Amino acid sequence: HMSFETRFEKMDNLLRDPKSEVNSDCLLDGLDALVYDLDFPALRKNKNIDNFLSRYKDTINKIRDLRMKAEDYEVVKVIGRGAFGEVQLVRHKSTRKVYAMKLLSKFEMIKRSDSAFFWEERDIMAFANSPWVVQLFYAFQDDRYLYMVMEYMPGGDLVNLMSNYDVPEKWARFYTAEVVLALDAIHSMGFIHRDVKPDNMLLDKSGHLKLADFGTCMKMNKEGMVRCDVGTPDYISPEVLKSQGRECDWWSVGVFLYEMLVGDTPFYADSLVGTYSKIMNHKNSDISKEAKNLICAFLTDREVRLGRNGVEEIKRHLFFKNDQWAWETLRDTVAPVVPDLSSDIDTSNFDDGEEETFPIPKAFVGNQLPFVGFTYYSN
Amino acid sequence: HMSFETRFEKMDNLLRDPKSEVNSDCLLDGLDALVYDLDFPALRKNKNIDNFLSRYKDTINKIRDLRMKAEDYEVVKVIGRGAFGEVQLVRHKSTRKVYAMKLLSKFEMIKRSDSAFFWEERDIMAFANSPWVVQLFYAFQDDRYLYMVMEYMPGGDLVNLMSNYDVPEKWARFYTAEVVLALDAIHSMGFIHRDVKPDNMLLDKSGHLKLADFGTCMKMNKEGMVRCDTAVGTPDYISPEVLKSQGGDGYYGRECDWWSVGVFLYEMLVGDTPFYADSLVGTYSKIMNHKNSLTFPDDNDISKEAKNLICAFLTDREVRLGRNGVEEIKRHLFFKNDQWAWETLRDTVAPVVPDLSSDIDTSNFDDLEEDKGEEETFPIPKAFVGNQLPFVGFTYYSN
Numbered sequence: 001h002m003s004f005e006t007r008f009e010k011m012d013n014l015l016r017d018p019k020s021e022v023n024s025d026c027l028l029d030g031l032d033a034l035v036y037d038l039d040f041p042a043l044r045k046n047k048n049i050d051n052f053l054s055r056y057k058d059t060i061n062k063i064r065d066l067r068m069k070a071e072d073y074e075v076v077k078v079i080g081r082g083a084f085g086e087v088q089l090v091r092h093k094s095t096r097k098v099y100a101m102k103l104l105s106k107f108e109m110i111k112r113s114d115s116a117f118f119w120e121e122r123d124i125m126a127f128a129n130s131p132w133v134v135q136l137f138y139a140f141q142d143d144r145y146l147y148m149v150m151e152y153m154p155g156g157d158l159v160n161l162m163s164n165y166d167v168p169e170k171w172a173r174f175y176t177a178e179v180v181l182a183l184d185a186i187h188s189m190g191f192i193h194r195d196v197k198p199d200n201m202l203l204d205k206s207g208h209l210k211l212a213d214f215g216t217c218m219k220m221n222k223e224g225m226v227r228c229d230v231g232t233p234d235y236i237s238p239e240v241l242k243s244q245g246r247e248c249d250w251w252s253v254g255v256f257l258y259e260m261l262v263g264d265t266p267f268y269a270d271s272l273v274g275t276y277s278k279i280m281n282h283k284n285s286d287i288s289k290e291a292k293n294l295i296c297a298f299l300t301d302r303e304v305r306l307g308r309n310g311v312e313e314i315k316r317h318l319f320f321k322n323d324q325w326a327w328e329t330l331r332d333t334v335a336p337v338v339p340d341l342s343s344d345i346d347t348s349n350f351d352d353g354e355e356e357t358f359p360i361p362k363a364f365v366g367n368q369l370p371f372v373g374f375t376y377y378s379n
Numbered sequence: 380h381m382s383f384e385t386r387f388e389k390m391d392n393l394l395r396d397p398k399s400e401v402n403s404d405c406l407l408d409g410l411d412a413l414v415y416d417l418d419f420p421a422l423r424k425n426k427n428i429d430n431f432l433s434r435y436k437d438t439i440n441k442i443r444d445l446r447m448k449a450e451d452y453e454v455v456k457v458i459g460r461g462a463f464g465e466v467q468l469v470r471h472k473s474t475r476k477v478y479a480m481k482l483l484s485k486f487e488m489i490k491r492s493d494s495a496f497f498w499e500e501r502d503i504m505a506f507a508n509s510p511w512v513v514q515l516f517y518a519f520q521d522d523r524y525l526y527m528v529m530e531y532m533p534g535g536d537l538v539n540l541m542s543n544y545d546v547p548e549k550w551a552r553f554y555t556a557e558v559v560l561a562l563d564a565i566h567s568m569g570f571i572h573r574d575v576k577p578d579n580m581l582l583d584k585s586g587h588l589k590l591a592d593f594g595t596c597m598k599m600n601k602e603g604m605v606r607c608d609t610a611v612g613t614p615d616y617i618s619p620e621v622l623k624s625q626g627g628d629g630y631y632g633r634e635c636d637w638w639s640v641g642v643f644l645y646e647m648l649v650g651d652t653p654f655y656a657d658s659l660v661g662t663y664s665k666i667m668n669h670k671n672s673l674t675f676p677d678d679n680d681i682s683k684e685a686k687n688l689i690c691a692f693l694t695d696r697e698v699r700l701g702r703n704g705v706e707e708i709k710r711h712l713f714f715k716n717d718q719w720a721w722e723t724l725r726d727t728v729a730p731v732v733p734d735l736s737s738d739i740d741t742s743n744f745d746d747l748e749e750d751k752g753e754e755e756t757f758p759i760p761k762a763f764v765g766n767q768l769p770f771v772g773f774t775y776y777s778n
């Protein structure tokens with residue numbers, strides 16, 4: 001039993017505790033949402049509602065206007081496209097600061113039952129506080145989209161990179177190993193990524209690596225494993241392809257490595273289903289002895305796969321031997337490729353029908369609800 | 380503008396501002412409300428809904444627990460009953476402090492279209508900061524009732540008082556004049572009482588006076604008037620103008636309170652309402668006929684002045700006492716004596732002081748009937764009905 005003077009402080013806590021589902025900004029998100037989901041001709045016909053909307057008209061419009069809205073960002077150039085919206089480079093009008101804003105169509109997010117997945121991604125990007133993980137500075141929302149303002153990566157994706165260069169075993173060793181420190185960072189936070197791939201790997205102005213998408217992430221329980229409900233084709237791990245009715249990330253890894261030295265998927269197939277079964281037959285489906293080894297050590301069945309035991313076990317692998325870097329020093333050494341940037345907005349490492357809207361309801365559908373609590377300020 | 384920072388210079392404000400319809404508490408009130416009006420089987424079948432109530436399940440239960448709830452209060456004795464709930468003496472378990480907590484059935488308040496009246500009552504009691512206005516410390520709500528925790532008044536209502544004594548012109552002069560200072564106080568907060576009556580007049584441990592219920596209050600416009608199609612008040616103590624109100628002429632100023640007061644005074648010296656009648660309607664028309672309904676049993680125990688003052692309040696608005704200034708009333712001959720001056724009457728020795736056993740002597744509160752069958756509940760909705768929305772923002776905690 002707490003006391004008065006106590007309970008009050010304790011409550012101010014929550015009203016400030018940004019990990020709280022009911023941080024002040026989340027309550028405001030609630031009032032906001034509610035006013036959205038209510039201001040419709042049909043519904044306003046109700047005493048209670050119309051009275052409400054008539055009382056929080058002025059006030060809530062004031063709010064909308066003050067809080068962060070998309071009108072606050074100048075969009076320099078679209079630099080990417082996810083499933084539910086586009087990622088565009090931006091500069092804050094009032095602050096002049098430059099971020100990368102990922103967009104999310106509330107609609108598309110509802111149409112597909114693919115809702116409530118971005119919570120893990122928000123949390124991670126906003127509190128991982130890690131050199132390995134992209135940092136979220138702001139997250140806000142209107143009627144149409146979610147917005148995630150985040151540390152811009154001038155470096156570009158590992159995809160563009162592998163496109164442009166004849167990757168040597170050196171580089172390979174570098175990028176791979178960093179991906180390993182990062183994935184271990186994630187797992188330390190008690191999450192599993194489930195989608196490891198070049199498309200998700202970005203680079204900071206210094207040519208080092210972070211992880212840039214976390215939609216796939218899933219919280220792993222006490223025993224370190226997960227009850228699972230896929231992700232990608234060219235990479236995916238079989239052991240998790242049967243639970244449908246951790247070390248999996250490591251599989252994805254090996255796949256990537258192969259892709260990097262080779263120039264194509266370790267189980268590429270013109271037909272996709274082909275790539276699928278081909279991964280199921282992994283056992284039977286220029287380079288160094290070690291490269292080969294390592295790869296095939298990851299590319300094995302769950303229980304005999306490389307990394308089943310400890311991450312350290314992976315670190316120590318022979319292919320991870322050199323006279324150019326140590327592990328807890330890698331982050332600070334000279335990247336294999338460093339980006340030459342003309343300004344704070346060089347979209348050079350990023351190469352070059354539409355969308356609809358929700359239908360006016362006849363009754364309360366509350367389409368804003370799955371989104372209350374998404375607003376986050378970093379100060 | 381200009382820019383980001385000023386935006387915050389309004390933001391942080393809207394959250395501190397206790398008079399803001401969106402003070403932090405208000406926002407918490409919104410989320411709470413929502414959870415209530417949402418957690419029902421039929422509704423839950425909605426993906427958006429279900430997902431919501433599944434994310435704020437834990438959290439919202441936490442909130443409910445911490446914030447002020449009624450389980451925080453030990454209910455000493457029921458000392459009163461209004462229209463929408465009972466009014467009970469209580470002591471805070473954790474703090475052991477003693478208050479009077481008035482309840483309000485959210486149902487009953489919805490049943491009758493009589494909703495959204497309590498906001499003016501709350502604002503006044505919480506911000507009047509006046510010797511004449513009972514003070515609110517805390518206001519909270521659950522699914523069922525609104526609660527208003529407020530300065531307890533061991534003194535008792537002037538109805539009990541008038542009951543137990545042969546009130547003399549002195550006393551009369553006292554109570555009445557304090558009623559005037561107080562009504563003037565409310566008048567200056569730009570409000571009209573509309574319901575002046577002994578029932579609303581309470582006493583503090585020093586035998587001095589305050590007004591105790593403000594449901595009837597209504598904010599008056601720049602010209603000092605208000606306009607009310609269907610008007611309120613109490614059968615006996617009603618002003619006639621307020622009385623003859625409808626779709627049409629229902630507009631009146633503050634001197635209607637002054638009428639109510641004259642009624643008071645009569646009641647106090649005579650022992651019955653100036654227009655009492657066994658049938659109510661009778662009192663009504665009797666009021667309409669005041670010019671010739673006014674009388675006094677030929678017991679010359681009444682003063683020239685008393686009678687005077689009384690009749691000066693009980694006249695038609697336009698020629699009634701106080702139409703001009705409150706000062707005008709203050710100066711009246713019946714308000715002449717060598718025992719108190721206006722700007723000092725609060726500080727003097729009350730005409731009756733309560734002898735109290737403890738900090739909980741409910742001695743000046745006669746016994747009342749408990750459960751009279753009044754506790755009824757909302758019916759489980761088939762669709763979202765939003766019954767808690769009218770009460771978003773009612774929560775307020777004291778500095």
Ligand SMILES: N[C@H]1CC[C@@H](C(=O)Nc2cc3cc[nH]c(=O)c3cc2Cl)CC1
Nearest residue numbers: 079080082087100151152153199212213
């Ligand atoms: N994960 C898949 C879907 C998301 C997409 C994606 O999110 N791409 C990007 C993410 C970020 C993150 C932070 N900063 C950036 O500049 C940036 C740029 C792009 Cl293009 C990548 C493929």
Ligand SMILES: N[C@H]1CC[C@@H](C(=O)Nc2cc3cc[nH]c(=O)c3cc2Cl)CC1
Nearest residue numbers: 458459461479513530531532578591592
């Ligand atoms: N408006 C009518 C119905 C309500 C009734 C009423 O509210 N009475 C009371 C008001 C208060 C107020 C503050 N403190 C108290 O202790 C207290 C006690 C009672 Cl019995 C008055 C007549």
